[PDB]
Write a protein that binds this ligand. Structure first.
Ligand SMILES: O=C(O)c1cc(-c2ccccc2)nc2c1cnn2Cc1ccncc1
Ligand SMILES: [Ca+2]
Ligand SMILES: [Ca+2]
Ligand SMILES: [Ca+2]
Length: 433
């Protein structure tokens, strides 16, 4: 009956973050509950031909939660989920949040090796995947787990075979018998994020810290109930999920519009069809869009805001976003470990085109340090160290690595090389291995 173990914030910091109104001690399911009360029939998710309202998202995720609870899956248990960019990803995410099951969302691009590693670490009693994924093409992988005593109690499959438990069947109808269930407490783990050598590391995220980053991001990006956000990046990625991502849009009462990937022609027609007004991309995908955008200018006119995060996004490329994609640019530099930086919507051109913005929170603390861990003079390049109301305090079950990436004041060293501009924004300059 024990809850998942994780490294806590110091009580003085926890109190401060409550005093500031950052941590409001609500489960992530708050996003749905509130949406259902205010606008139950407005669209929450558009996926291909499907239109899921707020109340449908709520009903369906409740259905699945009741069936997991009926099977004795709840607080103290974990789940591994691997689904593509479809509405069922969010139905499942909210169901597990409701049931108090700590979920790890694998990327759909992850393979047997990553999945095996994730299973050993969290020992999930629930596994949800797709029969269309290579790893679940046959039963070779599933059988291998019995051999090592790592078989989950329940396996659900999207695109199921006749002898599978069908994910859609566990979603469409509630359980026959009532068993009590609830979310994990708000200052306890809700789910595992993944770091971005070796398999990704597990980042425990609490309801308090994740909800805060979501609510605060939604305000920064000016989301509202008319927001239609394209979800073309992997749905589980911190960027696509929380920055402000699908959760941010749901928090603001808007609609998520799914796309399987960032391929421009398909994305452009989805943008046109649903009048998408916001999208989020990495630089390699921005380039692809730029190459087709002149010719398909008509299809993408409705875009009002494009977020770009990730690799290297030089000024000359950034300036092409408003020029060619005919929308405002926002640069985003974040990490699944916590800290996210945004250029603001009212920042100057120079800030927007040449920087990766500034932190969500006035209580995001940042040190920029040299090789001897001394704070560099203002404006100079150094290694980023950070802590704040939504930055984690250690990887899951990883005390040795944690000791190497945190200092005594619990600052996290991300490996990023940055400099603070005279205007107050960060410029990401490189990485230390
Ligand atoms: O440092 C990076 O390499 C990086 C990769 C990706 C990314 C996002 C989706 C898919 C693939 C890569 N996104 C990035 C990266 C840096 N900032 N961002 C935006 C971001 C925002 C929030 N949380 C995490 C990342
Ligand atoms: Ca519907
Ligand atoms: Ca536009
Ligand atoms: Ca133009």
């Amino acid at each position: 009956k024990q809850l998942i173990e994780f490294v806590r914030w110091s009580p003085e910091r926890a109190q401060h973050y409550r005093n500031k109104g950052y941590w409001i001690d609500q489960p992530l399911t708050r996003i749905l509950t509130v949406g259902v009360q205010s606008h139950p029939h407005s669209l929450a998710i558009i996926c291909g031909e499907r239109q899921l309202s707020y109340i449908e998202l709520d009903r369906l995720s409740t259905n699945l939660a009741t069936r997991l609870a009926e099977k004795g899956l709840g607080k103290g248990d974990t789940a591994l989920v691997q689904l593509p960019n479809v509405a069922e990803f969010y139905i499942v995410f909210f169901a597990l949040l409701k049931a108090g099951v700590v979920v790890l969302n694998a990327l759909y691009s992850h393979r047997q090796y990553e999945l095996n590693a994730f299973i050993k670490q969290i020992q999930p009693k629930l596994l949800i995947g797709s029969r269309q994924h290579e790893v679940f093409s046959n039963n070779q992988f599933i059988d291998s787990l019995h051999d090592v005593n790592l078989s989950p109690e329940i396996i659900l499959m999207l695109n199921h075979q006749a002898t599978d438990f069908g994910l859609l069947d566990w979603i469409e109808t509630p359980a026959e018998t009532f068993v009590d269930f609830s979310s994990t407490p708000a200052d306890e783990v809700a789910f595992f994020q993944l770091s971005g050598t070796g398999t990704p590391k597990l980042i425990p995220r609490t309801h308090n810290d994740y909800d805060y980053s979501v609510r605060a991001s939604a305000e920064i990006c000016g989301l509202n109930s008319n927001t239609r956000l394209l979800c073309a990046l992997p749905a589980p990625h911190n960027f696509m999920l929380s920055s402000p991502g699908a959760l941010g849009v749901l928090h603001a009462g808007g609609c998520v519009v799914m796309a399987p990937n960032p391929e421009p022609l398909n994305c452009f027609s989805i943008i046109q069809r649903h009048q998408v007004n916001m999208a989020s991309l990495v630089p390699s995908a921005v380039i692809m869009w730029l190459e087709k955008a002149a010719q398909y200018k008509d299809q993408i006119q409705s875009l009002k805001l494009l977020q770009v995060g990730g690799a290297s996004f030089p000024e000359s490329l950034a300036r092409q976003v408003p020029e060619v994609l005919n929308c405002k640019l926002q640069q985003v530099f974040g990490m699944a470990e916590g800290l996210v930086n945004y250029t603001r919507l009212d920042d100057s051109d120079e800030q927007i085109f040449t920087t990766q913005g500034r932190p969500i929170s006035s209580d995001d603390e940042i040190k920029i340090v040299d090789e001897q861990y001394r704070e560099v003079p203002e404006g100079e390049i150094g290694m980023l160290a950070t802590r704040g109301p939504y930055t984690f305090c250690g990887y899951y079950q990883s005390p040795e690595h944690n000791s190497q990436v945190f200092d005594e004041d619990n600052y996290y060293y991300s490996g990023d090389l940055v400099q603070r501009t005279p205007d107050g924004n960060l410029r990401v300059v490189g990485r230390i291995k």
